[PDB]
Amino acid sequence: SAPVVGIIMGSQSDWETMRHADALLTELEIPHETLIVSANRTPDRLADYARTAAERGLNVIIAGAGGAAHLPGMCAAWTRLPVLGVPVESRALKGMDSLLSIVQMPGGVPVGTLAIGASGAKNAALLAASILALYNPALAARLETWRALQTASVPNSPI
Amino acid sequence: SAPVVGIIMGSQSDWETMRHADALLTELEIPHETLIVSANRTPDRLADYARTAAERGLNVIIAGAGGAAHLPGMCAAWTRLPVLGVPVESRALKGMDSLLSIVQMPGGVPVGTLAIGASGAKNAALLAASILALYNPALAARLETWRALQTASVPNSPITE
Amino acid sequence: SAPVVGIIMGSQSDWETMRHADALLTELEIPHETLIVSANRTPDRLADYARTAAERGLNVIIAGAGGAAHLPGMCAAWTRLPVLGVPVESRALKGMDSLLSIVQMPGGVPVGTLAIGASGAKNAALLAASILALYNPALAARLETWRALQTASVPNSPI
Amino acid sequence: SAPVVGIIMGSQSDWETMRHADALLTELEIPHETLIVSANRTPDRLADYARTAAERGLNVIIAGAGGAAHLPGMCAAWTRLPVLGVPVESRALKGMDSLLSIVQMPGGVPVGTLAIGASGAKNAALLAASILALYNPALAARLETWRALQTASVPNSPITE
Amino acid sequence: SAPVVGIIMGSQSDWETMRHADALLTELEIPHETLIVSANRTPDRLADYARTAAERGLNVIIAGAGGAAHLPGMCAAWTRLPVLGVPVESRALKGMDSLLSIVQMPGGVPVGTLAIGASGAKNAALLAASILALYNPALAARLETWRALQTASVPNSPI
Amino acid sequence: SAPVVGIIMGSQSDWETMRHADALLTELEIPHETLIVSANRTPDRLADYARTAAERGLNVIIAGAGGAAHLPGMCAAWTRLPVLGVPVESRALKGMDSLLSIVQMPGGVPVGTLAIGASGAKNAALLAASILALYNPALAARLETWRALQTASVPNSPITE
Amino acid sequence: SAPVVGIIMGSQSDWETMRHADALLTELEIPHETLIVSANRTPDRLADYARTAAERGLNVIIAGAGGAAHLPGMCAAWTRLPVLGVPVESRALKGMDSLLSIVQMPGGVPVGTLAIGASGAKNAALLAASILALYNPALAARLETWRALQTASVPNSPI
Amino acid sequence: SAPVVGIIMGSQSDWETMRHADALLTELEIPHETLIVSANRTPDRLADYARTAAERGLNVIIAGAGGAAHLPGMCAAWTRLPVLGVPVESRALKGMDSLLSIVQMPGGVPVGTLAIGASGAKNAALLAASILALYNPALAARLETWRALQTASVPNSPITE
Ligand SMILES: N=C1[C@H](C(=O)O)N=CN1[C@@H]1O[C@H](COP(=O)(O)O)[C@@H](O)[C@H]1O
Ligand SMILES: N=C1[C@H](C(=O)O)N=CN1[C@@H]1O[C@H](COP(=O)(O)O)[C@@H](O)[C@H]1O
Ligand SMILES: N=C1[C@H](C(=O)O)N=CN1[C@@H]1O[C@H](COP(=O)(O)O)[C@@H](O)[C@H]1O
Ligand SMILES: N=C1[C@H](C(=O)O)N=CN1[C@@H]1O[C@H](COP(=O)(O)O)[C@@H](O)[C@H]1O
């Protein structure tokens, strides 16, 4: 019942994108928390959140942000847990700024980066699930089922 | 000594980049295998590798590729295991083609992507380590020590040649 | 009556773009099939489709996909037939990601790439027709007529 | 020994790239001609070449060009034959100007575009081969053998210098 | 009364952009013609148009096109007259493809390139006017007046 | 021998690029002046130059600049004469910053932009020549001869080292 | 009561973006002026404005423009005062052209550049405030309060 | 001799770029400190530095970083002082990743960004100088003299090797 995955995002504006990560984890019955945390506007909140993640029982953190998107990398800077990053698409640069600021992390501080937008958010949840599946047979089976349903449900011809 | 991490790359040319992932895993004492598999040139070899990864005991796959990089994504298409992708720097487009071909995976088939080049390879290994550390106390301690040393090793002031 | 060209696309989302390829082939009376095939979501479906293409009588394959667009290159990886690729334009990167993932194929596995979007889809069909025309006089004549009508129909002044 | 494939390029500078297309066709025993034709600098030469390609027996045209690359597109404008385009890498923009100028053809005038550089030239020849193989059993067998050898020749593990 | 400037565009689709060039020339009372000419769809029409431009009395040609935009450069390839190019903005790449295909012309075949879109079209007309002004005092004066009105009409504060 | 074309550049560093414009004008026998003027570093020098260009007899101004290239645009802001701009290649961004800073002029202040680098400088001179040729029969003939020679000088087949 | 910060923009079109800078300065009670000044259309107006800035008592200038955006750099070329630049997002290149034309200034003529768009405009005002705060305790306190309210007001969870 | 400007950089590798900022401040006689602080690798070190900057007497912070450059932005997150950012050129992406990671700060946390590379470092120091000059007549005169000399030092015509 206690969250094993933490979904954090730069602002309310990111919810439209990050909700796909939330929905996916719920579907796979993965206990998690969903919060707003800004690296630049709430730096101490991030430090505390990331520092204590492991102690609170979290195993994976999904972080999403737009623009310069410092959130994912800074979260990874304070936690030893795997951090997955979702570039949130934005008006001007369509998430290209977010993508580079997240994926180009220096050696030593990784952020497993997913695609820009909703699909990236969804995949961050699926990637987190695949990580948890390594030591949770029940979840692993549910993940196998989800993947199998995806493959089997793709139509053979367009409508 | 059974491998828990599989490092695959599209070619020998990618090794200069992927060797950094191999070195880091060895440093952290994580048993792994290193192979060359091309999605575009040896698709059946990739299919066989990816389909049997889980049953062979692998827990994480690190895939490196450049250009129209399809290796990580296709590997992820055949395995339920987490797949981490490393964009190998390309000559003309400096790895931008590699990056987009890897990171822009459709919803439903994830590939955790790392930085272009050596730094990415190193982080892919560190990310796989943090994944394995979730259920390996010994490795977790080793990872912690490694991270802590990195931070304490950063100089405080610049050296003027 | 048996299809000599196969139009495959990553998902239903690509139909809005790939229908232009379909329409063009029908106009030129080129027998063909139109299907949904995902390299990442239905890898085995793609392997089987591409592997058996030649045996089924297909001469050219038109493949369209958005995002990382692995479909065209992976199809070419399994078939000896000419594979033409159409980058499908997408929200964030406007098909630039799709273009690079398709056109930058390594030496040994070609994908004749067309423009991003509807025009690329239309041109993939026209390119496939020009290939088939090399050994089909009737089609070659119809293609000559289509090209001639295009050139002759361009207005001399804007409205 | 009549040519069935025509390899045209904008300049001598493009030859370093296009020679790879020439070499591959020769390897597959495909009769072809190799010429220098510039759309921007020798437009009338291009018009003559493209208009007569079909009547001269050519079946596929491989065109290489860099910068504001118009050679492939204009060639396609005058011939009904399939035209394959090879973006030659440019100094400043690393071939991005070459790529967009070639691949972004308007609906109605196709140009099958290949990768930037040598790899593109090689694939343009392989693509032309696969086109010709549709109605040439002998070439088809040769192409098949070539592809099969490429796949079997890929190493299984990396060499550590 | 005979046109001294020719405005040519790739297709009707470009009119929304190229009309700004047309409007500007009319405002400055510069005799001109406005036509649709496609380098790729009507190659012979372009060759003939460009080849005969000088003989017909044209002094400057404004050419606009989107996508690969071969029109401006190919026009310059056949005429000795100054050719000005306008990259027409397009759906996918926002005219970046058009810009590079026009501005990156090789040494020996120039195309004076203007900004992407309506402003570029307007400026192509103004640039053509500044060229004609060099040997037409009446026009030069009207151009001076237009430039003076532009500068004087800029508000001092936003509304 | 009064100059009719003015070639200005932001710095000595830009000369390697702009010398190509100077050489071409001299070749076509077009009297011109070549100076260094920076919009960002010598704005008043630019203002004086641009305001008096027309009264000094100049007919066309060729301006070269790199980086946040403002020289061509600001020159155009002060003169009614046609201003041609040459984007000088930049180190990091390979001239893309130079290109956009020059070509994206607001409606009302034109700058005819040429290719990044040497080719652009050469074309700026050729464009200025074609402008001057409109009312100079002698130059027109020289320009025609120059163009015709360029086309006839293009090789027909590639040289294989 | 006399303005200590000058907000200048390329045209009325930029107001939608630059108003955020205006609003921010008013909120922090920083006396300022808001004007339209075009480097390319009103060069002499800019020269005079920038040259006299210091004499008029201005301490910081915020300049915003789209497209080639010469305004910020040219303003900095004529004044010794700190000049902050805001790339205004535009149709075609989404402000990437504006960003490079502003940030890539040569050594010797700086322009502190902010993000593309509304956020950049807002931040230019905040940066100007932080500069003024260095020698105005009352403003410094109000700035501390504004920053504190920003941090404290960020929600803990998305709605 | 108390420092009023703080120059921080992510690594020793960034020094080649940031030394230009150090040199300019020293030239203008502006007391400053130069340190190495990484946002991604020494976050706690950055937090301590940024939080105490104001109380330690610093007035302006110049931060240089490359790649996923977070140093300037995070420093700005903890201090009310103006923070100027210098994008350090990166190998593959030539500093574009550095630039976007720095300049695209969210509304509410400003970072005045300068050009990619050395020029940016130099301008960051000049910008900090102009800020300090607002309330330092002596420095203002020195800055004025410096600017005036730069303008008068620009050559009027190019040197032909
Ligand atoms: N860049 C940040 C910073 C961070 O945590 O890195 N705080 C949030 N952002 C991003 O700022 C962007 C716009 O936020 P806004 O609508 O609150 O102004 C969002 O994409 C958010 O993720
Ligand atoms: N990238 C792929 C993968 C493939 O086959 O390569 N499967 C399909 N896609 C692309 O994913 C994009 C979005 O698909 P969606 O609306 O089903 O989430 C489409 O452009 C589709 O072509
Ligand atoms: N690229 C060309 C080619 C040329 O003349 O270069 N013919 C026209 N185009 C461009 O094709 C684009 C789309 O045209 P369309 O709406 O007729 O399909 C237009 O921007 C037009 O300028
Ligand atoms: N590029 C300039 C020039 C300048 O001052 O640098 N004058 C104004 N602009 C920009 O031109 C763009 C479009 O202006 P417009 O709507 O008046 O045509 C605006 O973003 C404006 O900032």
Atom of ligand 4 nearest to the CA of F104: 1
| Partners of A35 in beta bridges | A8
- G94 token code pair: 């989404």
- E50 token code pair: 């460009």
Strand order in the sheet with D32-36: C32-36, C5-9, C60-65, C83-87, C112-113, D112-113, D83-88, D60-66, D5-9, D32-36
For residue D10, which of D74, D52, D71 has the smallest C-alpha distance?
A: D71
For residue D114, which of C72, E97, C53, C61 has the smallest C-alpha distance?
A: C72
CA-to-CA distance for G122 and C96, rounded, in angstroms? Answer: 31
User: Quick one: which ligand is closest to E86's CA?
Assistant: 3
Q: Do D130 and D60 form a contact (C-beta atoms < 8 A)? A: no
Residue with tokens 């009302």: F108
The SS3 call for residue H151 is: helix
Partner E contacted by D106 (CB < 8 A)? yes
Q: Which domain holds residue D31?
A: 1-161
For residue C97, which of B104, A88, A99, D113 has the smallest C-alpha distance?
A: B104
Partner H contacted by F98 (CB < 8 A)? no
Technique used to solve these coordinates: X-ray
Nearest to D105 among E40, E43, E74 (CB): E40
| Overall size of chain A counted in residues | 159
Give exposure, D18-43, as e/b (b: 16+ Cβ within 10 Å): bbbbbebbeebebebbbebbbbbbbb
Q: Do G150 and A41 touch (CB under 8 A)?
A: yes
Q: Is the dihedral of CA D79, D81, D87, D88 positive or negative?
A: negative
CA-to-CA distance for C109 and C78, rounded, in angstroms? Answer: 9
- E79 token code pair: 């005429």
CA-to-CA distance for E69 and D103, rounded, in angstroms? Answer: 11
Instruction: Tell me, in angstroms, the distance from the centre of ligand 4 to residue G68's CA.
Output: 8
Give exposure, F65-81, as e/b (b: 16+ Cβ within 10 Å): bbbbbbbbbbbbbbbbb
Instruction: Verify whether ligand 3 is closer than 6 Å to residue D158 (CB atom).
Output: no
User: E47: which chain D residues are within 8 Å (Cβ-Cβ)?
Assistant: 43-44, 47
- B121 token code pair: 């390879």
Atom 12 of ligand 2 has which residue's CA nearest to it?
C66
CB atoms within 10 A of CB G46: 25
**Resolution of the experimentally solved model in angstroms:** 1.9
Query: CA separation (Å) from D14 to B93, D5, D7, D115, E88?
Result: 19, 18, 11, 14, 29
Nearest to A151 among C35, C42, C68 (CB): C42
- A122 token code pair: 């969804």
3-state helix vs strand vs coil in chain F, percent to 5? 45, 15, 40
From D44's Cα to the closest Cα of chain E, the distance in A is 9
Provide the greatest CA pair distance for chain G: 52
- C33 token code pair: 């099939």
CA atoms within 13 A on the CB side of G55: 6
E6 contact partners, CB below 8 Å, separation of at least 6: E32, E33, E35, E49, E53, E58, E60, E61, E62
From H98's Cα to the closest Cα of chain A, the distance in A is 8
Report H helices in chain C.
15-27, 43-52, 71-78, 96-103, 118-133, 137-153
Our count of domains for chain F comes to: 1
Asked whether residue C44 is marked as a ligand-binding residue, the answer is no
Asked whether residue D1 is marked as a ligand-binding residue, the answer is no
Residue with tokens 């593959």: H92
CA-to-CA distance for C140 and D60, rounded, in angstroms? Answer: 14
Atom of ligand 3 nearest to the CA of E90: 20
For residue D67, which of F142, E68, C126 has the smallest C-alpha distance?
A: E68
CA-to-CA distance for D14 and D20, rounded, in angstroms? Answer: 11
B37 contact partners, CB below 8 Å, separation of at least 6: B8, B9, B10, B45, B46, B49, B71, B75
Q: Do A114 and B112 form a contact (C-beta atoms < 8 A)? A: yes
What CATH number did the domain enclosing B144 receive? Answer: 3.40.50.1970
For residue F28, which of F118, F124, F108, F155 has the smallest C-alpha distance?
A: F124
A82 contact partners, CB below 8 Å, separation of at least 6: A59, A60, A61, A110, A112, A131, B127, B130, B131, B134
- C92 token code pair: 């964030």
Instruction: Verify whether ligand 1 is closer than 6 Å to residue A74 (CB atom).
Output: no
CA-to-CA distance for F50 and F35, rounded, in angstroms? Answer: 12
Query: CA separation (Å) from F19 to D9, D31, F113?
Result: 29, 45, 17
CA-to-CA distance for D2 and C156, rounded, in angstroms? Answer: 40
Flag whether D touches F (3+ CB pairs, 8 A cutoff). yes
- F121 token code pair: 């400088």
What is the DSSP secondary structure assignment for residue D106, as one 8-state letter?
P
Residue of H nearest to A101 (CA): H68
CA-to-CA distance for A116 and D24, rounded, in angstroms? Answer: 39
Query: CA separation (Å) from F93 to B115, D115, E102, F116, H99?
Result: 20, 22, 20, 12, 11
User: Quick one: which ligand is closest to A122's CA?
Assistant: 2
Asked whether residue F91 is marked as a ligand-binding residue, the answer is no
- A138 token code pair: 């029940």
Q: Is the dihedral of CA D22, D26, D27, D29 positive or negative?
A: positive
For residue F64, which of F131, F153, F125 has the smallest C-alpha distance?
A: F125
- H95 token code pair: 């500093």
CA-to-CA distance for G126 and G150, rounded, in angstroms? Answer: 12
- How many contacts, defined by CB atoms under 8 Å, are there between E and G? 42
In one-letter notation, the amino acid at residue F109 is V
Partner H contacted by G40 (CB < 8 A)? no
Report H helices in chain H.
15-27, 43-52, 71-78, 96-103, 118-133, 137-152
Residue of G nearest to H116 (CA): G104
CA-to-CA distance for A45 and A74, rounded, in angstroms? Answer: 12
In one-letter notation, the amino acid at residue A74 is M
The SS3 call for residue G8 is: strand
